[PDB]
Write a protein that binds this ligand. Sequence first.
Ligand code: 7LM
Ligand SMILES: *[C@@H]1O[C@H](CO[C@@H]2O[C@@H](C)[C@@H](O)[C@@H](O)[C@@H]2O)[C@@H](O[C@@H]2O[C@H](CO)[C@@H](O)[C@H](O)[C@H]2NC(C)=O)[C@H](O)[C@H]1NC(C)=O
Ligand SMILES: *[C@@H]1O[C@H](CO)[C@@H](O[C@@H]2O[C@H](CO)[C@@H](O)[C@H](O)[C@H]2NC(C)=O)[C@H](O)[C@H]1NC(C)=O
Ligand code: PLM
Ligand code: NAG
Lengths: 97, 203, 239, 274
Amino acid sequence: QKTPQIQVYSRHPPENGKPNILNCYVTQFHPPHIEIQMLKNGKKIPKVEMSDMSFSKDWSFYILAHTEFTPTETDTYACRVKHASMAEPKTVYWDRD
Amino acid sequence: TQVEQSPQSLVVRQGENCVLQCNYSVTPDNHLRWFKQDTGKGLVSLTVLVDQKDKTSNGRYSATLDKDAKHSTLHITATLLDDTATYICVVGDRGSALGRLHFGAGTQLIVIPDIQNPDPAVYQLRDSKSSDKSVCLFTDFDSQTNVSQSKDSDVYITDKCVLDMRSMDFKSNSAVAWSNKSDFACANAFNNSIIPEDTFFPS
Amino acid sequence: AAVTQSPRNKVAVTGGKVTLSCNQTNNHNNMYWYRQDTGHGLRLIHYSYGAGSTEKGDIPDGYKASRPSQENFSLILELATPSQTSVYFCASGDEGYTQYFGPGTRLLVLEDLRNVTPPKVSLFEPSKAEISHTQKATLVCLATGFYPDHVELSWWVNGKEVHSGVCTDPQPLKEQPALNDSRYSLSSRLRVSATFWQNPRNHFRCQVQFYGLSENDEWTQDRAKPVTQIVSAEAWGRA
Amino acid sequence: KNYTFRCLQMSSFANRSWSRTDSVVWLGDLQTHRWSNDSATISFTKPWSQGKLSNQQWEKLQHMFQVYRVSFTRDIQELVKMMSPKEDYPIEIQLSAGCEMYPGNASESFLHVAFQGKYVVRFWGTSWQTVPGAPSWLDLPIKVLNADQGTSATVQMLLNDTCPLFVRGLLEAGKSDLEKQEKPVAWLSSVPSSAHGHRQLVCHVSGFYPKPVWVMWMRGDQEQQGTHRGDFLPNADETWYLQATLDVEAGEEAGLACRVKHSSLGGQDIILYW
Ligand SMILES: CCCCCCCC(=O)N[C@@H](CO[C@H]1O[C@H](CO)[C@H](O)[C@H](O)[C@H]1O)[C@H](O)[C@H](O)CCCCCCCCCCCCc1ccccc1
Ligand SMILES: *[C@@H]1O[C@H](CO[C@@H]2O[C@@H](C)[C@@H](O)[C@@H](O)[C@@H]2O)[C@@H](O[C@@H]2O[C@H](CO)[C@@H](O)[C@H](O)[C@H]2NC(C)=O)[C@H](O)[C@H]1NC(C)=O
Ligand SMILES: *[C@@H]1O[C@H](CO)[C@@H](O[C@@H]2O[C@H](CO)[C@@H](O)[C@H](O)[C@H]2NC(C)=O)[C@H](O)[C@H]1NC(C)=O
Ligand SMILES: CCCCCCCCCCCCCCCC(=O)O
Ligand SMILES: *[C@@H]1O[C@H](CO)[C@@H](O)[C@H](O)[C@H]1NC(C)=O
């Protein structure tokens, strides 16, 4: 059993009020069953696309989630992951800096 | 079912050739085996075909397999009485013990033997212990003759039956009739049957 | 690579327990049980990949399997029913695809055993008229009055079984065809040369192995218990 | 120059009755196929994913895989029964199969199998074998798998002949995507460090293809040895993302610049001054 790493990052330089893509890259997990949510202000974003799950040379799985977003002064964005290796879901917040 | 055989049954005469078919939908199809099963006996493997387009032979038996068509034929050349049996097609879906076998329901073959020198007769045979009890034996008729059941329900008549005296190369048909009725004698036992004109009835 | 089955033939009652055994000394890990019924190919009931493994096949319902050792694989019918009347085949194999089949076991499950009856057996000696007409001699054996129809008829000359010159009726005939549980008769012929029958050192015997009750089956009728048994009749050749 | 073609299969067996098998196919770092458990057929994820195979050759190959997927599923379930009670569900199986393509007509094929996340089995030469460190109980599955001569002949053909031939055609057909150049765009930011007094500068670089790239924090012409490159992270559009951090003293930010070199820029480096 292996614990998921989660990395949250924008496709383009983030600019307040400008449309962009937010990525959540989940890696290093085993077994492959996983649930990934991207959140705006703690609420589930609806239109989230997922890449096909794949795995690396070391046999650990990875998958990329992404969604359209427009960053603002006040809105928070996060990626929440549920996996059997963790007792509780893990949440990583997008921090533009 | 996944494995179908044709014909369901057939009757041929000794010396004639015949062809039996197996068609299947089994996937994947690793190999196909033909078994011979004599009545009330077990399974005797005749051949196994393994290639995409295969041909095998084993004495008087030959077979083909075409995996594209999912079709096999078994050919029996110059049939003999002993070919009388059920012939079963089996398709194995793996090249290992992980496989399942898919069995056809079989084709029943009957081969009518050649009776070389008919000598139809009705003989009376007596019980080894009680001199008074007897049976009537209708024997040595050719395979054109049919033996009918009796009109009287207290007269018993068996179906015909061919025996093979192997060391003399000799075959003969026979049927047996017996009864307790007072009206029963061998002169009259097979009256319900069309028996040969020249049938020997000894004194 | 050989496989054996026991028993070879069995008559049982509805609700009774029946065990069918299969033995192989090939050190094969894998064994398989099938039944064969008219209109169907063999159908897989249970199989096993080793001692302690049993796995359900295509038609497992009503059967339990047991693999106590590498050698033995049993099929257990805890509550036998008439639908289990069949011919059962066991097979074994190693990691290869070949399955090596046993000789088969015939099982008949009756509703009730009350009509079960062993045969009488009579041997009818060759006609002197046949001998003078053909220089051949046909013996006839007749098994009569038996129920059910599970019998094996065989011919023996001087204590060794003969097959050449034999033909036995493909099935028994009903003695009372109008009746519910008619008894059966079966006939067989053995034909030999007149000189063989004429030799007084030749001892001919017709044997019928009858399959009926076991020692353990209950019996409440006044007549003798119709157990599995051999009945035979014999005669010596003569000039 | 060198490209690895990888067919990646992931199969999960939850219990005796539930399972799924999903595959993805990669040529280098570009996805060429997907085969979802819910799909009867393999999906192309590029216009050129059929390579130079005719429709008939592709149909035949796909049919072989369709038979494989069903057969593989039953085989694992039967192997579980065979080794019972040694191994039990849940079971995870991964396969990595393909070929690496070298200059000329040179290539090497592989078929590696992992069980519960550990590499245990490969196909090598003409048969299946376990690899060093694999458990002994696998010798029975291997014996059973190696009894299947038809599968051995097919796998030999796939690895020795089909893979390199197919991939040579893929490389031709996909040349323009494989050789694409996409430009990095960079941007700067800063966070508080693990220690109070320090700050951590971040140089973000995104949208570049292909993967090789150079990113360094710099003071004029002096490369800052403290620069720490993160991992290459994918963007959803088959470009890459990378960031290079530098821990510095609050106040020292002025004069620092992030410089990016990439093949797509044609020697016009990106230089971002703080
Ligand atoms: C990526 C590999 C693809 C190659 C497979 C191509 C051949 C194939 O599909 N073989 C199938 C079907 O084979 C039959 O039909 C065939 C005709 O179509 C033949 O006639 C052939 O002779 C039959 O046998 C066959 O069923 C294979 O066994 C399928 C699986 C092949 C890959 C197995 C990978 C190794 C698994 C190791 C498991 C180890 C872990 C484990 C062990 C035990 C329990 C649990 C886990
Ligand atoms: C296929 O090629 C192999 C040898 O190649 C290696 O194994 C392949 C599966 C693949 O991974 C390659 O890139 C590897 O380099 C042949 O195997 C040899 O076969 C001969 C006789 O058949 C035998 O004596 C050798 O020991 C085998 N070599 C090894 C290393 O085991 C195989 O025969 C080829 N099959 C066909 C059909 O071309
Ligand atoms: C993965 O795909 C397989 C094959 O399509 C699915 O197995 C089939 O499931 C259906 C619906 O339950 C059954 O009727 C079929 O018998 C199965 N087909 C075969 C060939 O076994 C399987 O359900 C899929 N798995 C998941 C989790 O969706
Ligand atoms: C044996 C694999 C290597 C050789 C394959 C050459 C043909 C590649 C075609 C791509 C199809 C991908 C199918 C995935 C099959 C699976 O593993 O489930
Ligand atoms: C098998 O696994 C699936 C998926 O985890 C589960 O939902 C299902 O209930 C299980 N089935 C059985 C028969 O245990």
